[PDB]
Amino acid sequence: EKTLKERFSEIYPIHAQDVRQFVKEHGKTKISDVLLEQVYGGMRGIPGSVWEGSVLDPEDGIRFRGRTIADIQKDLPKAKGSSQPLPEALFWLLLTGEVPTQAQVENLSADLMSRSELPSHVVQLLDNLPKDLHPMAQFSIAVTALESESKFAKAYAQGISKQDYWSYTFEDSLDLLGKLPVIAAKIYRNVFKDGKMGEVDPNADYAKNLVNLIGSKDEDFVDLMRLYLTIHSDHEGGNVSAHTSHLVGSALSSPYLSLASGLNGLAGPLHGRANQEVLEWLFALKEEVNDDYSKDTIEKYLWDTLNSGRVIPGYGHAVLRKTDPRYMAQRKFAMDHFPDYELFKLVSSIYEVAPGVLTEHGKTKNPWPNVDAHSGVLLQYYGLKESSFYTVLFGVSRAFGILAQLITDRAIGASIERPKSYSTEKYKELVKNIESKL
Amino acid sequence: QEKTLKERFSEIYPIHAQDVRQFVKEHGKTKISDVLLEQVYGGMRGIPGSVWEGSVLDPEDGIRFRGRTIADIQKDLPKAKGSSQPLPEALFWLLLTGEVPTQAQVENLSADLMSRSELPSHVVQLLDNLPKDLHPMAQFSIAVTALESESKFAKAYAQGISKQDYWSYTFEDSLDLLGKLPVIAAKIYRNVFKDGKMGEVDPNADYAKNLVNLIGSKDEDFVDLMRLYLTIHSDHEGGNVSAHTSHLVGSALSSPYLSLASGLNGLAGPLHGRANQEVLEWLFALKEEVNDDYSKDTIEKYLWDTLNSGRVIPGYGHAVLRKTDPRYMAQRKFAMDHFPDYELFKLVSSIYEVAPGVLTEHGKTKNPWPNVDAHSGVLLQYYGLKESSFYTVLFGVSRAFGILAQLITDRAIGASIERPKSYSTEKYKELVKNIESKL
Amino acid sequence: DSSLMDLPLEIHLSLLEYVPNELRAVNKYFYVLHNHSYKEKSLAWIAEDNYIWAVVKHSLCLYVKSLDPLRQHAREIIQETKEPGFNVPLCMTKYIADSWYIVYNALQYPGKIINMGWDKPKERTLMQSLTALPVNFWSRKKDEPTPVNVWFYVKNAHVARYIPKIITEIGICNYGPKQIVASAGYINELITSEGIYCVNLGHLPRLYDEQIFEGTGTTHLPLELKAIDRTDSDVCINSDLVLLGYDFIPYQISKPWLLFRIEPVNSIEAIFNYSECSFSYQFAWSLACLQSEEKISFPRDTIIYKPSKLIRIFVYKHPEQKQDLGQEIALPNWNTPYLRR
Amino acid sequence: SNVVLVSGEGERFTVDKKIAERSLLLKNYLVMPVPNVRSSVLQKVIEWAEHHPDEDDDDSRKSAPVDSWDREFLKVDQEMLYEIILAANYLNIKPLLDAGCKVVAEMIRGRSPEEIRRTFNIVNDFTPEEEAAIRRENEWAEDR
DSSP, rough: OHHHHHHHHHHHHHHHHHHHHHHHHHOOEEEEEEEHHHHHTTTHHHOEEOOSSSEEEETEEEEEETBBBHHHHHHSSSTTOOOOHHHHHHHHHHHHOOOOOHHHHHHHHHHHTTTEEEEOHHHHTTSOTTTTTHHHHHHHHHEEEEEEEEGHHHHHHOOOOGGGGHHHHHHHHHHHHHHHHHHHHHHHHHHSSSSOOOOOOOOOOOOHHHHHHHOOOHHHHHHHHHHHHTTOOOSSSHHHHHHHHHHHHTTTOOOHHHHHHHHHHHTSSSTTTHHHHHHHHHHHHHHHHHOOOOHHHHHHHHHHHTTTTTOOTBBOSSSSSSSSSSHHHHHHHHHHHHHTTTHHHHHHHHHHHHHHHHHTTTOOOOOOOOOTHHHHHHHHHOOOGGGGGHHHHHHHHHHHHHHHHHHHHHHTTOOOOOOOOEEHHHHHHHHHHHHOOO | OOOOOHHHHHHHHHHHHHHHHHHHHHHHOEEEEEEEHHHHHHHHHHHHOEOOSEHHHHHHHHEEETOOOHHHHHHHHHTTTTSSBBBBHHHHHHHSSSSOOHHHHHHHHHHHHHHHHOOHHHHHHHHTOOOEEEEEHHHHHHHHHGGGGHHHHHHHHHHTOOOHHHHHHHHHEEEEEEEEHHHHHHHHHHHSOOOOOOOOOOOOHHHHHHHHHHHHHOHHHHHHHHHHHHHTOOOOOSSHHHHHHHHHHHHOOOOHHHHHHHHHHHHHHTTOHHHHHHHHHHHHHHHHTTTTOHHHHHHHHHHHHHHHHTTTOTHHHOOSSSSSHHHHHHHHHHHHHHOTHHHHHHHHOOOOOOOHHHHHHOOSSSOOOTHHHHHHHHHHHHHHHHHHOHHHEEEEEHHHHHHHHHHHHHHHTOOOOOOOEEOOOOHHHHHHHHHTTTT | OOOGGOOOOOHHHHHHSSSHHHHTTOOOHHHHHHHHHHHHHHHHHTTTHHHHHHHHHHHHHHHHTTHHHHHHHHTTTSSOOOOOOTTTTTGTTTTTTTTHHHHHHHHHHHOEEETTTTTOOOOOEEEEEEEEETTTTTTTTTTTTOEEEEEEEEEETGGGGGGGEEEEEETTTTOOEEOOOOOOOGGGGGGOEEEEEEEEEOOOOSSSGGGSSSSSSSOEEEEEEEEOOSSSSSSTTTTTTEEEEOOOOOOTTTSOEEEEEOOOOGGGGOOOOOOHHHHHHHHHHHHHHHHSOOOOOOOOOOOOOEEEEOOEEEEEESSTOOOOOOHHHSSOSSSSSOOOO | EEEEEETTTEEEEEEEEHHHTTHHHTTOOOOEEETTTTTHHHHHHHHHHHHOTTTOOOHHHHHHOOOHHHHHOOOOOOHHHHHHHHHHHHOOOHHHHHHHHHHHHHTTOOOOHHHHHHTTTTTOOOOHHHHHHHHHHHTTTTTT
C-alpha cells in the first residue's frame, strides 16, 4: 500500500499543471482592488495567500479539503476503540486531498514515531533553559536547534534541482512533526513539573505520544488530544502563524525555520491565546456569581457585560453565520465524558442563553461560539491548568496544516512573497497623482 | 538638557499618528492598485502591502533613508573621533525620528546600548553548548528568542497596560535587544570559528567597534569598515522577507525579540540574505580559472562564457535601480583609500570596468550595474572575516536597526494586525469565473 | 612551640581578609580586631561627623538591640559602651561600637519593607513605603546583586492568577523616572496551594547614572515603592491575596529560584523584623527630607525579636535542580540578618 | 651583579642583584644583614625569588591564585611557614607574603574554632555562651 510520499508524488504534478494553466488563462483578471485604508488597515479584505488545505465555509464552518468537521468525523480513520479522528489522518487529507485508509494512517504514525528521538544537543538545550523563559519561546528555540539536521538545507548547499525541493522539504517536515510532541512534553515537564518524561509506547500515535510523555495514561485524555490536535490543524492561510511560515518558507528556509517563525507569530497575544482569554473570563464570572449557573443570573451578567461596552469572548464572528462545529464537537465530548463538571456546566449555561442575549443586544452580527469557547474546560479537567502552555498545544496542531502548505509550495515552485512598500510621504504623493488624473 | 532618543520620539510620534489619521480619513477609499490573479500566485509582486517609513528606494538615486541618500548620511550623520565613516547608531536615530542627531546624542545612545550589552547567564551557556555544525543564523535566532525572558513588553502586557503605552515597552525592549546583538554575533563567531574566547565590552566604544573588538580585532580600519557596513545595510523598504516577517509577527503584539527572530529566519533564506556570499563564491571560481590574470580580455572572456552558459553575474542587474548602487561606490571608495593593491579588490574593480559593457552587449540585463553585495565580500575578506556562513549574521546585526525602528513606529501609531484573505485554487477559480461572467 | 599570635598585627589583618568568620571565633583578640576592622571600614565610608550617623543613631541601635536574643553574649564582649545620646560619642555608643560588623552590613544593603496595611476604582494603591538604598548598588551588581522579592499570602492556587496584576512601581523618592519590577506572567501557574509565597521580581534596575552622584558625597538614596492593585477584582479587598511586604535578600545564591512557599503564619513578625523596617523607613525618610525640598506624597508611617525555623519549598529556576528537603531543614534560619560584606 | 646577604646566624648568601631586589627593603638601600632570619629560612626565600599585582590593587591580590610550585614550596613544617612569612614581612616580599597568608587561610577556612586552636596553639578565652553567639553571627554570613 502506497505511503504518503508516494501518493503525493502522483498528485502534485496535476496540481502544478492546473495552476499553470489557470494563471495562463485568467492571470490578467482583476480579482480585487487595493484601497488606501486597506494597506493602512492590515491588508483587510485583500486576497494575499493561496492556501489549499482548508477554506472557511460561511455557513458550515471550516472545510478541510471541502470536508466539514462532520464529514471528517465519519470519513477519517481513527484509533482502535476510539471515535475521535486521528490528526495524522487529517494531515494526509490536507496534503493529498484524499482520505487515507486504516493501514496508511497506522504506518504514517509508525514513521513519525521512528523520527521522534530528539538529538542530544536539543535535549541538553531544553534541560538548561530557565523556567521563566516562556514555553512558546522554548518551543521555537528547540525547533530552530533542529536546523543542523535539515535535509533540505544540506541538499540546497550541494546543488539539487528545483523540481527536487519538495522531496527534502517532505522529509524535514516529517522529522519535525515526529519531534513536536516530544518537545512540547519536555517543555511541560521541565517548567511545570519535575522534568521526568513519561513512558513511551512504540506503537503509540501522535496525540497519544504527547499525553503519555506529559505523564498521563488516561485514554479519555488521549482522545481529547486526538480531537484537539485535529480541529486545530489548519484554518486558511490569512492568520499570522500560517502567513509567517509561508512567508519565511518562500525564501527557501527549511521547515524548521519556517515553523519556528510561525510559532513566534502564534505566540502573539492577538493570535494564539483566545482560548486563554475565555478561561480568564469564565473564572472572573465564576467568582462574581459564586457558582450560580441559573438562566436569570447568567443573562444579567451577559447584559451587564454588554451594556458596559465589553464583548463576550468566544462568541461573535465576522464571517461564520452559524455556530462553529468545532465548538459542538467539544460539547459532545464533555457531555459524553464529564457532563457534571462544574466548569462545563458554566459553559453550557452560557451556550443556552448567550446567543439570545447577544441577538437581543443587537451589536453583534453573528452571536455564535467558536472553538476557543470550549477548549479550555476540557484541558482543565485532565490537569492542563497552565494557560501559558495552551499556545504550545495550538502549535503542535497547527504545524500540520503549516507543513502541508509548505510541502505544496515547494512541489509547485511557489514564488517568494515580496509586496511593494512606500512611506507615508510617498503614499501621499501616490494618492495625489492618482486623484489628479481622475 | 540634550533630549534622549526616547524623549524626542515621544514628542514626534503623536504628530505622525495624527497625520496618518487625517490622511486615511481624507483618502481612505482611494484605490491605489488592483489585484490581478497572476499577482496572487506571483508572491504579491507589485502589490502595495506595507507601510514602511524608514527608507524608500529611489530608482535614480538609490536607497534613501528618510529622504537622505548614501551621500547625504555620509555628510550629515555624526562620526567617531578621527573617522569619516557614519555611525549606525546615528542612522537608527534618523530612521526612528526622521531627524539628524548631534554628536553628543549619538555618543549618549551608544553608551545606553553598551549599558544593555550584558548577556544573561542562560544565553551565554546556551550558545557555548550548541553544536558548531548548527548554522550561525540559527544560533543567532535562538539567542534572540532566548532573551524573551527579559522582555518588558511581554511582562507589561500580562499586567494589562494601556494600548497607548505599548510603544514605551517596545522601545526599551528594542534598545535592550540592539545592545546585545554584537555580543551575540561575536559570541557565535568566537565559538564556531575560533577558541571561544570573547573579550569584555569597552564602555566608551560604539556599536560597530564592540563587534570588531569582541570578534578579535583592534584594527581601527576594520572598525571603520563595520561602521560603514552596519550603516548601509540597516534598512531597505518593507517588502523584503526579513522586514515583512518582523512586521507580521509584531502585528500580533509579539515582543521585539520574537519579531526580530522571525525576521532573522526569513533573512536566513537562500533567496534573501545570501547575495553577498554568492558573489564571493563566483569571484573565487573566477580567480582560479584566470590564474590571477585580471586583464580586460580575460575578464571579458569569463563574463561572456558565464553569460552564454545561462548563469547571471551575481551582484549585477537590478529590477528598479537604474544606476550603480551608491552603497557599492562607498565600498569601492573604502577599498581605494585603505587597500588599493589588494588582489581580490583589483579583481572586483576590473569587473566593475568590464561587466556593465558586457551585460549591455548581451542585451538581457536592463540595469547592468553592481549593488552593495558585489563589493561587501572582498572588504570582509581583507580583515580576516573569511567565513562566509557568518556573513548573514552581520546582515542581521545591521538590518535589526531598520526592523526595530519600524516596530517601534507601528506600536506608537497602533498599527493593525496584518491579516489578509486567503483562498484555495478551487475557490480562486470560482471567484475569477464570476468576475468574467459579470464582465 | 610557636603560635599564630606570634605573628605581627599586619599579618593578622591580612588573614582577616581571607578568613574573618573563622578567626573572629578563635579568641577575644581576633574578635575585637575584627570589630575594629569594620569600625575603620564604616568610618572611612561614612565619617563620624556625617549626617547619616546623626539621623539614624537611635533607630539603628534599636535594630541591633532586637538582635540581642541571638548575639547578646557576643556583643557584650566589648563592655566600654554607654546608651546612645547627644553626649555619648559614636565610638562609645552601645549597640554600635560593639557591633560594627553588623552596623556596616546594615548600612551596605537595602532593608526590608513591610506593608503596614496588611491587616486592614480600576487602580487601588495597596502599599506605598520607602527603604534606604546604597547609591552604588548597580556598579556592584556582579558580586552583590540587589534582588526584589515580594511576599504574598495566597488563599488558594486559583486566586494566584491575580499576582501579575498587582504592579510594583519603584524609583527614587522625588527624583528620576519610576520603573516597574515584575516577574513573568505565568509564575502564578507554579503556585498549586494556599500559603505564603515569596516571588522573585528580578533585580533592581538601573535607576540613574552613578556618575551624577560623584563628588557630591551622597552614599544613600530614598527608594520609593508603590504597589498598585490593577486586578479589576475584589481578590485583595476580600483578603484572598494579601501583600505582606518586600525584601531584597539574595536567598540561596547557589540555587536560583522563581518562588518559594512557607506555611501560613499567624504573625508577620516571623518574616519581617519591625525594628529593622523602622530603621530602613526612617533612614530613607530622613534622606528624602535632606536631599529634596519637594513634599513627600504619603504620611510618615510608624513601624511598630521572633526568629523561628520556617521550612521553605522552592520552585527552582534550573530544570535539573532537584529537591533536597534534608538540606533545607538543616540550613540556618533565613529570617535572620544577612551579613554579606 | 651579585649582592651578599647575611643571615642572623652569620651565614653569608651570595645572590643576584635583581633576585634580592624582590625585597622593597633591599631595593631601597641607597652586604646586607637580615637579622632574626635563620639561614635555612633565607635559603627558601632566595629559592622562591629565583623561581619567580601592585600594591593598592588589593582586590587583584585577593583574587590572585597560589602557584602550584609555591604550594609545594610552602608545604614545609608549620614553624618554617611562620618564619618564611615573618621574613617576607620584614623584607617586604609582598608577593611571597600573600602566598604564605593564603596557604595559612586555607588551613583555617571551614575548620571549627576548636580545630584551629589545636592546629595553631591558641588558648580559648571565650565562654560557652560567647562562642554560641559568635557561631550564630557567622551563620548570618553564609548562603541560606
